[model samples]
Target: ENGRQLGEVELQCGICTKWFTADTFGIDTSSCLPFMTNYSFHCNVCHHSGNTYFLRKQANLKEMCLSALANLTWQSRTQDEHPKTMFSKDKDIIPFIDKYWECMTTRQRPGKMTWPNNIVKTMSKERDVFLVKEHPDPGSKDPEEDYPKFGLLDQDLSNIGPAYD
Candidate 1:
């Protein structure tokens, strides 16, 4: 019987020609093909004909937003108080809402306010919802669940909160 040779595998980037581990690129190789363990021989070349890293990263925005919204929604429902409130009677949000409402109603030539509202409205329409949902119930919780699912892309000026800080 022949004894098997044991050794650590090395990987090198084709472009950089530098060695690396699966962890370096946030990949798992335990279940990958044997050649994958050797980075130099593996196919992680950037600017390749079939490059997908940027595409995948770009596609993650929706999922990331959903995850964050879920977390903020959960906190609002379960926690007694938030670290900071989003809305107020005469503070940052109130003024924001006043100016924003004007823009929306008049179809005025958009300033900064118009751009965001357009973004929010467009995103909401994409989701088939009227508004992006947020936490602390905006003022208080409602059973109807009519609030829009919250999205970072929303440009609503009055959508104030400590989350930004």
Candidate 2:
């Protein structure tokens, strides 16, 4: 039987068939390094674990670019004065973003280029539609300096109630 016990308080090890007490040995299973989910279980005796329950996540540049494009489309729609504006505006924007995203994903020197050719082309064409503007620089010498500024703003320090006033 699956998940059958070898003894009164011991579980059978799938790997070695040895009976061992199941325990959480202070393992951080959620980390991307080992990439374990709650469904994963380990047999301490055999030093064995379940097969990875989820696919190893890698940087998906395509999805990132698509999401950004979608957000822009949504914002543009929301800001328009005309209530009857067609939601089909994304029809053209998505294809443009897709081509640019494809170009970016295939780039060999992603870090070297400040702006890719496809990105420049797409931005130029869609500038008016997207209402594009230069994002303000963080103006911090170190990137970590920017984090603390916004980090605590969302945190509730009062601890006086369940909700922060």
Candidate 3:
């Protein structure tokens, strides 16, 4: 009695809302198999394909933060070098970082900002300097002679403190 019981499997068309059995659908079940993971099903009636299961790619929070930090640092450095062009070059990357921080805050209480502090410090240490050269004296035989000069170092402006409480 158990051997005689062969249940029929049916599928509904996503487009036309028509139910079909393997025989009525006229599709070869032996050749085309259903997908198990991150797959889509196609409707034969309307020829429309819909995703059965989809996995989203995760965003890299660390990379986003680091890129924002680099841009902010560069902008500050440029401000020291050329104050007039700072506003034009400012791309306002802080909002993106803040949004990421806000998303993170949904899970935990804010303590310290994860702004890649060490990297910012290192970058500042490497580039924050104002080079100054003395003007050549008029009495000098060679007015084009190299002038004594020194660099006036500036501190890192990347230290914006914690992004949140």
Candidate 4:
């Protein structure tokens, strides 16, 4: 009989003759990690596909990268994986956002709009396009001091809302 109990759960896969639990599989089956939102890939060894029901349980960028490396074992690279740590001088978030805009426009085209070839450039002039409708210029300085002297306004707080909004 393959209906033996292992940790209160009986084996039902039919390939195993004894009871099996998550411990026997050498993996945690609990989905408790907060950052591990979801993934849509299959595990080759377990023949498991779709979202993985496990958790990496990391709370920060470095820890998250290590956890991913442990589970995937393929993306562990020595190069700088996290760039947010490099910006130390400017207390503002504009530089990073400007870099993101530059990258999206020059290096990588927006994936959402590339479809439907005949969509004219003018026809796609809806709202902000790939960026916030009103973003700080790439060369903008710290808002507190730079505003009064240069006669420029502070960072646009109006556009700060839900990304889809």
Top-TM-score structure, candidate number: 1
- Candidate 4 lDDT: 0.25
Tens-digit lDDT string for candidate 1 (104-135): 12334355643333334444555631234443
Better of 2 and 3 by lDDT: 3
Clashing pairs in 2: none
Q: Could you arrange the candidates by lDDT from highest to lowest?
A: 3, 1, 2, 4
lDDT of 2: 0.31
Model 4 steric clash pairs: none
TM-score, cand. 1 vs. native: 0.23
Q: In model 3, which regions exceed 4 Å deviation?
A: 1-49, 52-54, 65-91, 100-109, 116-165
Roughly what TM-score does model 4 have, to 2 decimal places? 0.15
lDDT of 2 by residue, 1-165 (tens): 433322212223334543333333433323221111112223654453442112222224323333344434344545757521112223443444344443223435445443423433444344333333233236834333222110111111111111111
Off by over 4 Å in 4: 1-28, 32-58, 74-165
Top candidate, metric lDDT: 3
Each model's lDDT: 0.33, 0.31, 0.34, 0.25
Q: In candidate 1, what residue range of length 10 has the lowest lDDT sum?
A: 1-10
Q: List the residue pairs that clash in candidate 3.
A: none
Off by over 4 Å in 2: 1-58, 82-111, 118-165
If scored against the real structure, what TM-score would every candidate get? 0.23, 0.21, 0.22, 0.15
